[PDB]
Design an enzyme around this catalytic site. Structure first.
Site, PDB file in Angstrom:
ATOM      1  N   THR A 159       9.491   6.232   2.974  1.00  0.00           N
ATOM      2  CA  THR A 159       9.519   4.876   3.550  1.00  0.00           C
ATOM      3  C   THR A 159       8.253   4.032   3.374  1.00  0.00           C
ATOM      4  N   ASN A 180       4.418   9.625   4.090  1.00  0.00           N
ATOM      5  CA  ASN A 180       4.701   9.189   5.471  1.00  0.00           C
ATOM      6  C   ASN A 180       3.687   9.805   6.415  1.00  0.00           C
ATOM      7  N   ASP A 261      19.487   4.331   6.369  1.00  0.00           N
ATOM      8  CA  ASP A 261      18.646   5.537   6.377  1.00  0.00           C
ATOM      9  C   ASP A 261      18.862   6.361   7.638  1.00  0.00           C
ATOM     10  N   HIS A 420      15.152  12.298   1.805  1.00  0.00           N
ATOM     11  CA  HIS A 420      14.697  11.592   0.605  1.00  0.00           C
ATOM     12  C   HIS A 420      13.231  11.927   0.466  1.00  0.00           C
ATOM     13  N   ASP A 687      -7.127   9.020 -13.471  1.00  0.00           N
ATOM     14  CA  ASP A 687      -6.934   7.700 -12.882  1.00  0.00           C
ATOM     15  C   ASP A 687      -5.910   6.854 -13.641  1.00  0.00           C
TER      16      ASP A 687
HETATM   17  C1  LIG Z   1      -2.967  -0.242 -10.726  1.00  0.00           C
HETATM   18  O1  LIG Z   1      -3.559  -1.517 -10.465  1.00  0.00           O
HETATM   19  C2  LIG Z   1      -4.719  -1.436  -9.656  1.00  0.00           C
HETATM   20  C3  LIG Z   1      -5.111  -2.845  -9.188  1.00  0.00           C
HETATM   21  O2  LIG Z   1      -5.602  -3.569 -10.294  1.00  0.00           O
HETATM   22  C4  LIG Z   1      -5.834  -0.708 -10.426  1.00  0.00           C
HETATM   23  O3  LIG Z   1      -6.865  -0.367  -9.534  1.00  0.00           O
HETATM   24  C5  LIG Z   1      -8.110  -1.056  -9.717  1.00  0.00           C
HETATM   25  O4  LIG Z   1      -8.804  -0.536 -10.834  1.00  0.00           O
HETATM   26  C6  LIG Z   1     -10.131  -0.988 -11.095  1.00  0.00           C
HETATM   27  C7  LIG Z   1     -10.678  -0.075 -12.194  1.00  0.00           C
HETATM   28  O5  LIG Z   1     -10.655   1.296 -11.789  1.00  0.00           O
HETATM   29  C8  LIG Z   1     -11.057  -0.968  -9.857  1.00  0.00           C
HETATM   30  O6  LIG Z   1     -12.253  -1.700 -10.151  1.00  0.00           O
HETATM   31  C9  LIG Z   1     -13.428  -1.156  -9.481  1.00  0.00           C
HETATM   32  O7  LIG Z   1     -13.743  -1.886  -8.308  1.00  0.00           O
HETATM   33  C10 LIG Z   1     -14.663  -1.224  -7.456  1.00  0.00           C
HETATM   34  C11 LIG Z   1     -14.714  -1.949  -6.109  1.00  0.00           C
HETATM   35  O8  LIG Z   1     -13.407  -1.950  -5.564  1.00  0.00           O
HETATM   36  C12 LIG Z   1     -13.377  -2.426  -4.192  1.00  0.00           C
HETATM   37  O9  LIG Z   1     -12.953  -3.779  -4.049  1.00  0.00           O
HETATM   38  C13 LIG Z   1     -11.582  -4.043  -4.354  1.00  0.00           C
HETATM   39  C14 LIG Z   1     -11.324  -5.557  -4.291  1.00  0.00           C
HETATM   40  O10 LIG Z   1     -11.027  -6.042  -2.994  1.00  0.00           O
HETATM   41  C15 LIG Z   1     -10.654  -3.199  -3.459  1.00  0.00           C
HETATM   42  O11 LIG Z   1      -9.293  -3.364  -3.801  1.00  0.00           O
HETATM   43  C16 LIG Z   1     -11.011  -1.710  -3.538  1.00  0.00           C
HETATM   44  O12 LIG Z   1     -10.166  -1.004  -2.635  1.00  0.00           O
HETATM   45  C17 LIG Z   1     -10.116   0.429  -2.870  1.00  0.00           C
HETATM   46  O13 LIG Z   1     -10.893   1.173  -1.937  1.00  0.00           O
HETATM   47  C18 LIG Z   1     -10.501   1.018  -0.569  1.00  0.00           C
HETATM   48  C19 LIG Z   1     -11.466   1.786   0.335  1.00  0.00           C
HETATM   49  O14 LIG Z   1     -12.802   1.587  -0.123  1.00  0.00           O
HETATM   50  C20 LIG Z   1      -9.044   1.472  -0.359  1.00  0.00           C
HETATM   51  O15 LIG Z   1      -8.573   1.149   0.936  1.00  0.00           O
HETATM   52  C21 LIG Z   1      -8.111   0.845  -1.404  1.00  0.00           C
HETATM   53  O16 LIG Z   1      -6.837   1.449  -1.294  1.00  0.00           O
HETATM   54  C22 LIG Z   1      -8.680   0.981  -2.829  1.00  0.00           C
HETATM   55  O17 LIG Z   1      -8.713   2.364  -3.150  1.00  0.00           O
HETATM   56  C23 LIG Z   1      -8.240   2.726  -4.469  1.00  0.00           C
HETATM   57  O18 LIG Z   1      -9.138   2.352  -5.518  1.00  0.00           O
HETATM   58  C24 LIG Z   1     -10.371   3.074  -5.576  1.00  0.00           C
HETATM   59  C25 LIG Z   1     -11.300   2.473  -6.628  1.00  0.00           C
HETATM   60  O19 LIG Z   1     -11.966   1.360  -6.068  1.00  0.00           O
HETATM   61  C26 LIG Z   1     -10.087   4.564  -5.805  1.00  0.00           C
HETATM   62  O20 LIG Z   1     -11.281   5.313  -5.870  1.00  0.00           O
HETATM   63  C27 LIG Z   1      -9.201   5.098  -4.670  1.00  0.00           C
HETATM   64  O21 LIG Z   1      -8.835   6.432  -4.929  1.00  0.00           O
HETATM   65  C28 LIG Z   1      -7.940   4.245  -4.456  1.00  0.00           C
HETATM   66  O22 LIG Z   1      -6.974   4.603  -5.422  1.00  0.00           O
HETATM   67  C29 LIG Z   1     -12.521  -1.506  -3.303  1.00  0.00           C
HETATM   68  O23 LIG Z   1     -12.856  -1.724  -1.945  1.00  0.00           O
HETATM   69  C30 LIG Z   1     -16.026  -1.124  -8.157  1.00  0.00           C
HETATM   70  O24 LIG Z   1     -16.863  -0.318  -7.357  1.00  0.00           O
HETATM   71  C31 LIG Z   1     -15.920  -0.546  -9.590  1.00  0.00           C
HETATM   72  O25 LIG Z   1     -17.144  -0.763 -10.303  1.00  0.00           O
HETATM   73  C32 LIG Z   1     -17.738   0.432 -10.914  1.00  0.00           C
HETATM   74  O26 LIG Z   1     -17.412   0.586 -12.293  1.00  0.00           O
HETATM   75  C33 LIG Z   1     -17.802  -0.561 -13.052  1.00  0.00           C
HETATM   76  C34 LIG Z   1     -17.106  -0.643 -14.415  1.00  0.00           C
HETATM   77  O27 LIG Z   1     -16.656  -1.966 -14.612  1.00  0.00           O
HETATM   78  C35 LIG Z   1     -19.334  -0.627 -13.159  1.00  0.00           C
HETATM   79  O28 LIG Z   1     -19.714  -1.900 -13.649  1.00  0.00           O
HETATM   80  C36 LIG Z   1     -20.039  -0.398 -11.810  1.00  0.00           C
HETATM   81  O29 LIG Z   1     -21.311   0.158 -12.095  1.00  0.00           O
HETATM   82  C37 LIG Z   1     -19.280   0.465 -10.763  1.00  0.00           C
HETATM   83  O30 LIG Z   1     -19.759   1.805 -10.810  1.00  0.00           O
HETATM   84  C38 LIG Z   1     -20.520   2.177  -9.626  1.00  0.00           C
HETATM   85  O31 LIG Z   1     -19.830   3.099  -8.792  1.00  0.00           O
HETATM   86  C39 LIG Z   1     -19.540   4.337  -9.442  1.00  0.00           C
HETATM   87  C40 LIG Z   1     -18.566   5.156  -8.596  1.00  0.00           C
HETATM   88  O32 LIG Z   1     -19.007   5.194  -7.255  1.00  0.00           O
HETATM   89  C41 LIG Z   1     -20.848   5.084  -9.762  1.00  0.00           C
HETATM   90  O33 LIG Z   1     -20.635   6.263 -10.514  1.00  0.00           O
HETATM   91  C42 LIG Z   1     -21.812   4.196 -10.551  1.00  0.00           C
HETATM   92  O34 LIG Z   1     -23.054   4.871 -10.593  1.00  0.00           O
HETATM   93  C43 LIG Z   1     -21.905   2.760  -9.983  1.00  0.00           C
HETATM   94  O35 LIG Z   1     -22.733   2.730  -8.836  1.00  0.00           O
HETATM   95  C44 LIG Z   1     -14.683  -1.080 -10.368  1.00  0.00           C
HETATM   96  O36 LIG Z   1     -14.928  -2.347 -10.945  1.00  0.00           O
HETATM   97  C45 LIG Z   1     -10.327  -1.489  -8.594  1.00  0.00           C
HETATM   98  O37 LIG Z   1     -11.074  -1.317  -7.404  1.00  0.00           O
HETATM   99  C46 LIG Z   1      -8.919  -0.894  -8.424  1.00  0.00           C
HETATM  100  N1  LIG Z   1      -8.239  -1.594  -7.346  1.00  0.00           N
HETATM  101  C47 LIG Z   1      -7.332  -1.066  -6.503  1.00  0.00           C
HETATM  102  C48 LIG Z   1      -6.762  -1.986  -5.458  1.00  0.00           C
HETATM  103  O38 LIG Z   1      -6.940   0.102  -6.525  1.00  0.00           O
HETATM  104  C49 LIG Z   1      -5.299   0.589 -11.046  1.00  0.00           C
HETATM  105  O39 LIG Z   1      -6.205   1.019 -12.041  1.00  0.00           O
HETATM  106  C50 LIG Z   1      -3.912   0.466 -11.675  1.00  0.00           C
HETATM  107  N2  LIG Z   1      -3.472   1.794 -12.048  1.00  0.00           N
HETATM  108  C51 LIG Z   1      -3.042   1.988 -13.297  1.00  0.00           C
HETATM  109  C52 LIG Z   1      -2.629   3.386 -13.664  1.00  0.00           C
HETATM  110  O40 LIG Z   1      -2.986   1.068 -14.121  1.00  0.00           O
HETATM  111  O1  LIG Z   2      11.810   2.743   9.959  1.00  0.00           O
HETATM  112  C1  LIG Z   2      11.000   3.714   9.931  1.00  0.00           C
HETATM  113  N1  LIG Z   2       9.765   3.627  10.605  1.00  0.00           N
HETATM  114  C2  LIG Z   2       9.444   2.378  11.370  1.00  0.00           C
HETATM  115  C3  LIG Z   2       8.981   1.058  10.627  1.00  0.00           C
HETATM  116  O2  LIG Z   2       7.599   1.135  10.466  1.00  0.00           O
HETATM  117  C4  LIG Z   2       9.260  -0.166  11.564  1.00  0.00           C
HETATM  118  C5  LIG Z   2       8.535  -1.424  11.062  1.00  0.00           C
HETATM  119  N2  LIG Z   2       8.879  -1.717   9.629  1.00  0.00           N
HETATM  120  C6  LIG Z   2       9.259  -3.032   9.330  1.00  0.00           C
HETATM  121  O3  LIG Z   2       9.704  -3.828  10.179  1.00  0.00           O
HETATM  122  O4  LIG Z   2       9.094  -3.396   7.967  1.00  0.00           O
HETATM  123  C7  LIG Z   2       9.482  -4.694   7.561  1.00  0.00           C
HETATM  124  C8  LIG Z   2       9.057  -4.795   6.101  1.00  0.00           C
HETATM  125  C9  LIG Z   2      10.020  -5.136   5.139  1.00  0.00           C
HETATM  126  C10 LIG Z   2       9.692  -5.253   3.778  1.00  0.00           C
HETATM  127  C11 LIG Z   2       8.367  -5.014   3.403  1.00  0.00           C
HETATM  128  O5  LIG Z   2       7.894  -5.112   2.113  1.00  0.00           O
HETATM  129  C12 LIG Z   2       8.337  -6.228   1.403  1.00  0.00           C
HETATM  130  F1  LIG Z   2       8.161  -7.405   1.985  1.00  0.00           F
HETATM  131  F2  LIG Z   2       7.743  -6.370   0.253  1.00  0.00           F
HETATM  132  F3  LIG Z   2       9.643  -6.002   1.236  1.00  0.00           F
HETATM  133  C13 LIG Z   2       7.372  -4.680   4.369  1.00  0.00           C
HETATM  134  F4  LIG Z   2       6.116  -4.467   3.990  1.00  0.00           F
HETATM  135  C14 LIG Z   2       7.719  -4.556   5.730  1.00  0.00           C
HETATM  136  C15 LIG Z   2       8.973  -0.562   8.668  1.00  0.00           C
HETATM  137  C16 LIG Z   2       9.643   0.715   9.264  1.00  0.00           C
HETATM  138  C17 LIG Z   2      11.401   4.975   9.182  1.00  0.00           C
HETATM  139  C18 LIG Z   2      12.619   4.847   8.497  1.00  0.00           C
HETATM  140  C19 LIG Z   2      13.214   5.827   7.759  1.00  0.00           C
HETATM  141  C20 LIG Z   2      12.598   7.050   7.699  1.00  0.00           C
HETATM  142  N3  LIG Z   2      12.928   8.234   7.047  1.00  0.00           N
HETATM  143  N4  LIG Z   2      11.917   9.133   7.333  1.00  0.00           N
HETATM  144  N5  LIG Z   2      10.991   8.610   8.107  1.00  0.00           N
HETATM  145  C21 LIG Z   2      11.326   7.264   8.397  1.00  0.00           C
HETATM  146  C22 LIG Z   2      10.692   6.202   9.181  1.00  0.00           C
END
Ligand SMILES: *[C@@H]1O[C@H](CO)[C@@H](O[C@@H]2O[C@H](CO)[C@@H](O[C@@H]3O[C@H](CO[C@H]4O[C@H](CO)[C@@H](O)[C@H](O[C@H]5O[C@H](CO)[C@@H](O)[C@H](O)[C@@H]5O[C@H]5O[C@H](CO)[C@@H](O)[C@H](O)[C@@H]5O)[C@@H]4O)[C@@H](O)[C@H](O[C@H]4O[C@H](CO)[C@@H](O)[C@H](O)[C@@H]4O[C@H]4O[C@H](CO)[C@@H](O)[C@H](O)[C@@H]4O)[C@@H]3O)[C@H](O)[C@H]2NC(C)=O)[C@H](O)[C@H]1NC(C)=O
Ligand SMILES: O=C(NCC1(O)CCN(C(=O)OCc2ccc(OC(F)(F)F)c(F)c2)CC1)c1ccc2[nH]nnc2c1
Ligand SMILES: [Ca+2]
Ligand SMILES: [Ca+2]
Ligand SMILES: [Cl-]
Ligand SMILES: [K+]
Ligand code: NA
Ligand SMILES: [Zn+2]
Length: 806
Positions: A159, A180, A261, A420, A687
């Site tokens: 979900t 989940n 579901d 699922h 990655d």
């Molecule tokens: C699917 O599409 C997505 C979206 O486009 C692709 O993912 C992107 O890929 C980019 C390339 O890998 C990546 O760019 C990097 O950005 C880093 C900063 O990122 C932060 O800011 C963004 C913007 O708001 C934000 O979205 C990020 O959020 C991540 O982290 C938070 C928590 O911190 C999570 O809540 C969130 O879910 C997300 O996590 C995911 O991404 C991270 C990577 O950031 C993963 O590690 C996680 O597992 C998770 O999957 C961030 O808050 C930036 O730091 C990078 O820069 C480094 O590299 C460049 C090269 O250009 C270099 O210039 C720099 O030196 C720097 O290196 C430094 O750090 C190194 C490592 O610590 C270190 O070794 C060095 O010494 C340096 O100090 C980089 O530019 C981008 O962030 C993600 N975005 C997302 C949303 O995931 C994805 O690739 C696609 N997948 C496929 C298969 O195509």
């Molecule tokens: O329903 C479940 N849990 C409770 C829930 O959190 C209540 C609130 N919620 C909601 O109101 O969501 C609206 C929404 C609708 C669409 C979106 O994405 C978008 F907009 F792109 F479509 C988007 F982000 C968000 C999502 C479901 C659940 C179901 C079946 C399961 N099977 N096993 N475990 C399970 C747990």
């Protein structure tokens, strides 16, 4: 603590949530236990039901009613959805002939067509056909709008990962909601379905549609609804919002249904008890559509009817127990069910060993109903590895089964008959897409596509620029009448070199030998032309791949194949060749078994050597253009060049040789020629993106020859198979794979048997989109065809799944 002593008078379902501890009146307040004392009284009226009866017509407004049938309701925006049908002789929306919507037909003051997303939990794809008799409203949307036979969810088919993928365009590994149930080692926090931790914003990465819309000045209804709020009220709340003044009226909305579901889990996907939930969801769509008609919005709003994943038959007696495999079963934590994720119960226990755990779970029982993997070895199409929340050890469970730690977990938690979560290629897990409105096409069927693609389209529909995401923007333009996004091909970053003969045989010292010494004018002119690319239009059918990063490479031409050879990685990035239906498979002549030949176009410094393969007792080598498909004895010598050679474990050569000797021919046979582009992939940090050179963890011993983690092939032919691959006039057909380059065949439990019993099954498991390969290689394919770019993008997102029919 909330000072819940304020009021909801006139604030019912307010769009801007107020700050603690003033009490809330938003559609989520229940879930935070923070509603004002009077929220139920004022905002959740139920009196008199949800429908107007003949005798409520013209009635005097009684505010206590759930909805109204009074004369002023249309303009108050709060009639029961069937008001006009009962009280004004109007027809239900579903009874009306469907009529093309060429242009949005909206009330004055509407700046854009609103988007309404109608999301249904557990709505299996085959419900569209199988339950069509009891879903008239949904059937009308489907058949009158744009529909796909099914939409592919993301893995795990659970979900939260799927709803949050719809909202963001991102793979769960990127968005963070990887199941989940999750443990995040860095926070040292646990996420669960039930509970408060899931409300903490740190779990949720990327940028969901509602935030994208907000930042770009498009107002959104609040997407989420508390369980207790009945469907009918959600629908009325949405319709009420749509009657607001222009400056306050949102442009995007979401409805969510817990059904089918909820019942599916209890009764199984096709349990006789499932007819009723399906009727009910239809009734709700009817209420929506009737209410839009009333407000004259039924030819203005784009509606999306979309599911998160399907439902499969699963019962307690189909459970595999980790206690039957491991003796150390108490030292592990299992995330259980339709997927398995394993970690150490304690970080302070150094008697924990993933290696011995995988081994104790590998092919142990004749009919084993899950397979263990290290996450990085999972099929690359799942894109399920690059997150610290995904445990190193993962169990892929067979459809219809569960995995659990001990039997006590199951009986001290049969209750359920459906579940699922399985692999996203599984038919039972597939779900639904319908688009209906002015911006979607009329009576149009589109091919199955992945749910990761919709976020882009929802942005297109709303005039928003999508945040970076995993869709391929343009790949779904064919769903749309207009609002299309016209992408341009990315620019080539490196241009190739075209080396001529530059080196003498004696300048090489590679420890290679070839019995090629057994040495005309008509045919010296001939093979010269072959090295300048005289056959290149045959073997390179779609132009050359563009290199999208800074590097140094050479185009190498040959009679039978063309390659882009990387001086940095010492091997081709890609090898392209065509095998027509008439082509003959030959063997490698006895004399030439160990033949490798220096390439006079490429310096010794930028070549592999045979010595390193001799010294590396783990690593052998194979070829990218196969010697077996050489066009002539004399062309075979080309296949043995040191520049066609790639490193391969003996265990993998079993797989590779069988693909090259047997399956390429079969595909040429079945598809009327194939064009094959093959190559290496390096993804040591799993990655899904091309590794730079400083990321390679493994070399052929004593050399700078880098070892691929995987090998790909893209196999293209004419969609109209009455045309040969090399003379196709119309649309193309493609299947690809990304095979893992592993030192053993543990993955395949039948591997001690002949390759005709297991290799192909392995290959099918590791089916891929061309687009997956592009991410993993920094290459951009299909640069020169006669086809439109949007059509090529669709092609590049296609996945050949090997499931039977839906
Ligand atoms: C699917 O599409 C997505 C979206 O486009 C692709 O993912 C992107 O890929 C980019 C390339 O890998 C990546 O760019 C990097 O950005 C880093 C900063 O990122 C932060 O800011 C963004 C913007 O708001 C934000 O979205 C990020 O959020 C991540 O982290 C938070 C928590 O911190 C999570 O809540 C969130 O879910 C997300 O996590 C995911 O991404 C991270 C990577 O950031 C993963 O590690 C996680 O597992 C998770 O999957 C961030 O808050 C930036 O730091 C990078 O820069 C480094 O590299 C460049 C090269 O250009 C270099 O210039 C720099 O030196 C720097 O290196 C430094 O750090 C190194 C490592 O610590 C270190 O070794 C060095 O010494 C340096 O100090 C980089 O530019 C981008 O962030 C993600 N975005 C997302 C949303 O995931 C994805 O690739 C696609 N997948 C496929 C298969 O195509
Ligand atoms: O329903 C479940 N849990 C409770 C829930 O959190 C209540 C609130 N919620 C909601 O109101 O969501 C609206 C929404 C609708 C669409 C979106 O994405 C978008 F907009 F792109 F479509 C988007 F982000 C968000 C999502 C479901 C659940 C179901 C079946 C399961 N099977 N096993 N475990 C399970 C747990
Ligand atoms: Ca669900
Ligand atoms: Ca990588
Ligand atoms: Cl999970
Ligand atoms: K060797
Ligand atoms: Na095996
Ligand atoms: Zn469910």
């Amino acid at each position: 603590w909330t000072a819940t002593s304020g009021s909801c008078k006139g604030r019912c379902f307010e769009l801007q949530e107020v700050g603690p501890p003033d009490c809330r009146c938003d559609n989520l307040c229940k879930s935070y236990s923070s509603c004002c004392h009077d929220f139920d009284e004022l905002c959740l009226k139920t009196a008199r039901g949800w429908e107007c009866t003949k005798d409520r017509c013209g009635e005097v407004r009684n505010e206590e009613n759930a909805c109204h049938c009074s004369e002023d309701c249309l303009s108050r925006g709060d009639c029961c959805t069937n008001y006009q049908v009962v009280c004004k002789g109007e027809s239900h929306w579903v009874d009306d002939d469907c009529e093309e919507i060429k242009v949005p037909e909206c009330p004055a003051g509407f700046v854009r067509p609103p988007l309404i997303i109608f999301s249904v939990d557990g709505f299996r794809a085959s419900y569209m056909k199988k339950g069509s008799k009891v879903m008239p409203n949904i059937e009308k949307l489907r058949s009158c709008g744009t529909h796909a036979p099914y939409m592919r969810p993301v893995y795990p088919t659970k979900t939260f990962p799927n709803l949050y993928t719809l909202a963001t365009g991102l793979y769960p590994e990127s968005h963070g909601i990887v199941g989940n149930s999750m443990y995040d080692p860095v926070f040292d926090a646990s996420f669960h379905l039930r509970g408060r931790e899931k409300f903490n914003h740190r779990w949720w990465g990327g940028q969901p549609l509602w935030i994208t819309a907000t930042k770009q000045g498009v107002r959104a209804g609040t997407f989420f609804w508390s369980v207790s709020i009945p469907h009918e009220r959600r629908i009325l709340t949405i319709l009420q919002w749509l009657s607001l003044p222009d400056n306050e009226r949102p442009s995007v909305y979401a409805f969510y249904s817990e059904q089918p579901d909820f019942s599916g889990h209890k009764y199984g996907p096709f349990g006789p008890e499932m007819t009723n939930p399906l009727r009910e969801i239809d009734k709700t769509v009817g209420q929506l559509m009737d209410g839009l008609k009333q407000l004259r919005l039924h030819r203005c709003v784009n509606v999306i009817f979309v599911g998160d994943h399907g439902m499969e038959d699963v019962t307690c007696d189909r459970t595999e127990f980790l206690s039957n495999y491991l003796t150390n079963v108490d030292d592990i934590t299992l995330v259980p069910g339709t997927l398995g994720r394993i970690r150490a119960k304690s970080i302070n226990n150094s008697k924990y060993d993933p290696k011995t755990i995988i081994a104790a779970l590998t092919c142990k029982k004749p009919d084993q109903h899950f397979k263990p993997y290290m996450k990085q070895h999972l099929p690359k199409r799942l894109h399920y590895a690059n997150n610290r929340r995904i445990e190193d050890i993962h169990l892929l469970v067979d459809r219809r089964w569960h995995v659990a730690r001990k039997p006590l977990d199951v009986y001290k938690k049969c209750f359920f008959q459906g579940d699922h979560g399985f692999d996203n290629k599984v038919n039972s897990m597939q779900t639904v897409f319908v688009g209906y409105g002015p911006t979607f096409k009329y009576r149009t069927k589109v091919p199955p596509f992945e749910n990761i693609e919709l976020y882009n389209v929802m942005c297109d529909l709303l005039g928003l620029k999508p945040a970076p995401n995993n869709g391929t923007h343009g790949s779904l333009n064919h769903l749309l009448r207009t609002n299309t996004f016209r992408p341009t091909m990315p620019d080539e970053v490196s241009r190739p070199n075209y080396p001529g003969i530059m080196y003498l045989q004696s300048e090489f010292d590679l420890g290679c030998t070839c019995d090629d010494k057994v040495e005309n004018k008509l045919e010296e002119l001939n093979k010269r032309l072959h090295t300048k690319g005289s056959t290149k239009e045959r073997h390179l059918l779609y132009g050359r791949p563009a290199v999208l990063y800074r590097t140094s490479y050479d185009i190498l031409y040959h009679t039978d194949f063309e390659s882009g050879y990387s001086e940095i990685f010492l091997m081709p990035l890609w090898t392209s060749y065509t095998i027509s239906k008439q082509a003959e498979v030959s063997s490698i002549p006895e004399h030439l078994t160990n033949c490798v030949r220096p390439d006079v176009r490429v310096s010794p410094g930028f070549s592999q050597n045979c010595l390193a393969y001799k010294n590396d007792k783990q690593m052998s080598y194979g070829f990218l253009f196969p010697p077996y498909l050489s066009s002539s004895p004399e062309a075979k010598y080309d296949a043995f060049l040191v520049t066609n050679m790639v490193p391969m474990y003996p265990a993998f050569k079993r797989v590779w040789a069988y693909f090259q000797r047997v399956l390429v021919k079969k595909y040429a046979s079945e598809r009327n020629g194939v064009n094959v582009i093959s190559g290496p992939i390096f993804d040591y940090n799993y990655d899904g993106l091309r590794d730079t050179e400083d990321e390679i963890k493994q070399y052929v011993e004593g050399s700078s020859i880098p070892v691929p983690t995987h090998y790909y092939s893209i196999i293209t032919s004419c969609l109209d198979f009455t045309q040969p691959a090399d003379k196709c006039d119309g649309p193309l057909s493609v299947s690809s794979f990304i095979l893992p380059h592993r030192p053993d065949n543990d993955e395949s439990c039948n591997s001690s048997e002949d390759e005709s019993k297991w290799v192909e099954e392995l290959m099918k498991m590791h089916t891929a989109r061309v687009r997956d390969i592009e991410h993993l290689t920094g290459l951009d394919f299909y640069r020169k065809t006669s086809r439109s770019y949007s059509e090529i993008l669709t092609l590049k997102t296609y996945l050949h799944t090997y499931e039977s029919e839906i």
